């Protein structure tokens, strides 16, 4: 139960790095929408950022949180310098995908997928 840390000794410094990354993403989002001509609004992008953070927000391992921070910073700077294009940043929203229903009746009508 004794492991080697990556950057954070415990979960508090991991949360510190998470807060810094969230602040930087929140600062970037209006500049991204202005720079690459996105159909979304500024509020919707920040809601998308927060939904990503809430999707990742169930972990407690400091190494996992540090690696998630590192991946977030890579995607962040990949958005800072214009490499992740309009299609790449619009892949987070899945506008052309029909969302799979979660209830048993529609999952029964659709097919055999559990």
């Amino acid at each position: 139960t004794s492991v080697k840390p990556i950057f954070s000794r415990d979960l508090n410094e991991a949360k510190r790095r998470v807060r810094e990354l969230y602040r930087a993403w929140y600062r970037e989002v209006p500049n991204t929408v202005h720079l690459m001509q996105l159909d979304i609004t500024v509020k919707q992008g920040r809601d998308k950022v927060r939904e990503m953070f809430m999707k990742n927000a169930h972990v407690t391992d400091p190494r996992v949180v540090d690696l998630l921070v590192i991946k977030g910073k890579m995607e962040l700077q990949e958005t800072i310098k214009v490499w992740k294009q309009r299609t790449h940043v619009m892949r987070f929203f899945h506008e052309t995908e029909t969302p799979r229903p979660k209830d048993f009746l529609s999952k029964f009508y659709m097919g055999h997928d559990p």
Partner: protein, 208 residues
């Protein structure tokens, strides 16, 4: 004598064994295993803590002079606790030799980058991180190098599917190149091309 069998020179085996003993006794702190294959190649398996000292010693020693990094790669063997095996192949031009240095990692223990030792290790470690998810400490610029922007998952892992999870197509409604969950018109048909009879008795593992 035999035209279908490779001729094997034992002098290379002796020289590589001597150099393996040499390196192993210079660096007992990091070296965990030394072996020479029947193909006459030297493999030195070291602790991840001694990657930078081992690479620096092999680069700057008078009797090693391994000044050229042939390649840096990773092998995913997902049955070990540390599933990634990082392999550094090095070429010595002064002594006209080749060495291989092996170390281990898993998804949550990064190892030190050797960009300070070899500058090719920059792009090679970027590729290793992109394909296997092995983080490298003190890399000047560590990011993806081969996959698409926003690609999720590391595709050279054994548990990553061959066709992947998403595929790209042009949607005229949004006028974009959108990524959708993957559907194949013809599924990749895997083949069970393993003979149930033992081929090589020299590698017969003992029963469990």
């Amino acid at each position: 004598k035999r035209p279908t069998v490779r001729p094997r020179s034992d002098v290379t085996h002796k020289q590589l064994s001597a150099f393996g003993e040499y390196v192993a006794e210079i660096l007992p702190k990091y070296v965990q295993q030394v072996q020479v294959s029947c193909l006459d190649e030297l493999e030195i398996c070291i602790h991840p803590d001694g990657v930078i000292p081992t690479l620096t010693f092999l680069r700057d020693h008078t009797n090693a002079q391994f000044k050229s990094l042939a390649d840096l790669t990773a092998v995913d063997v997902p049955t070990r606790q540390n599933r990634f095996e990082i392999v550094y192949n090095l070429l010595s031009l002064r002594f006209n030799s080749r060495i291989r240095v092996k170390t281990y990692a898993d998804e949550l223990t990064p190892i030190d980058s050797i960009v300070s030792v070899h500058i090719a290790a920059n792009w090679y470690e970027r590729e290793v991180w992109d394909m296997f998810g092995v983080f490298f400490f003190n890399h000047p610029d560590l990011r993806r190098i081969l996959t698409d922007y926003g690609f999720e998952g590391h595709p050279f892992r054994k548990d990553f599917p061959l066709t992947g999870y998403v595929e790209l197509r042009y949607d005229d409604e949004v006028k974009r190149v959108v990524a959708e969950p993957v559907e194949l018109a013809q599924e990749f048909r895997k083949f069970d091309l393993n003979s149930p009879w033992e081929a090589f008795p020299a590698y017969r593992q003992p029963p469990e």
